[PDB]
């Protein structure tokens, strides 16, 4: 789902 991509980006940027 394209609508989940920025959530994944946020998680990456955090972890990291």
């Amino acid at each position: 789902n394209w609508w989940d991509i920025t959530n994944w980006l946020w998680y990456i940027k955090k972890k990291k």
Partner: antibody
Amino acid sequence: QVQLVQSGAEVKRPGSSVTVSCKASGGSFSTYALSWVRQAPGRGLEWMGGVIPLLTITNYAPRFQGRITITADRSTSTAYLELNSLRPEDTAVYYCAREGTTGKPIGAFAHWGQGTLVTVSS
Amino acid sequence: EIVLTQSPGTQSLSPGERATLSCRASQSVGNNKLAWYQQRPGQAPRLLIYGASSRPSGVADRFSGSGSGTDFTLTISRLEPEDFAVYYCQQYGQSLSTFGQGTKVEVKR
């Protein structure tokens, strides 16, 4: 606070192409999804497409795929909608909208531009 | 494409009344990615509910969302004068996001 400001009203001839801009301030332009939604007579709200600037990836609604380009300029935090081969049924108010956050993005559109009236007419 | 049906498309209600608005999807909406917006004439839409039941801070707690799968409801516990407006549901559980046709809540007199 996030604010989206759009360019002003346009009159466009049938068959031409229109570009509408949406300048963002506040929050992170690059990592949150920006969409375009229009409001045409008799048709409620209709989602047209969106872009995630950092990835330069777009997602277009099939009804507009082939007629639309959405771009984002990270240097100015401005997103653009191009719509081509204009017809009278494309007369509408065009809004840009950015997803909200809790921060963590929410997908749904919390932040809206003021709208741009595009009139397609001879 | 997921088609969202908002029926009835108009409800005539009295100030102070409870309102329940239906949004029914033609197939299941993934992860309950269902939002509700309010729109008044001459204004941009405003987010009320996301994720079927989550409410942004700033949105009045008289608005609540519920439901799952294909059957979603926006409840307004007590209509204030500013609540007479058009309400749209939107699904974003597939890459192709779609909106319902809206329900106008109008003042019964």
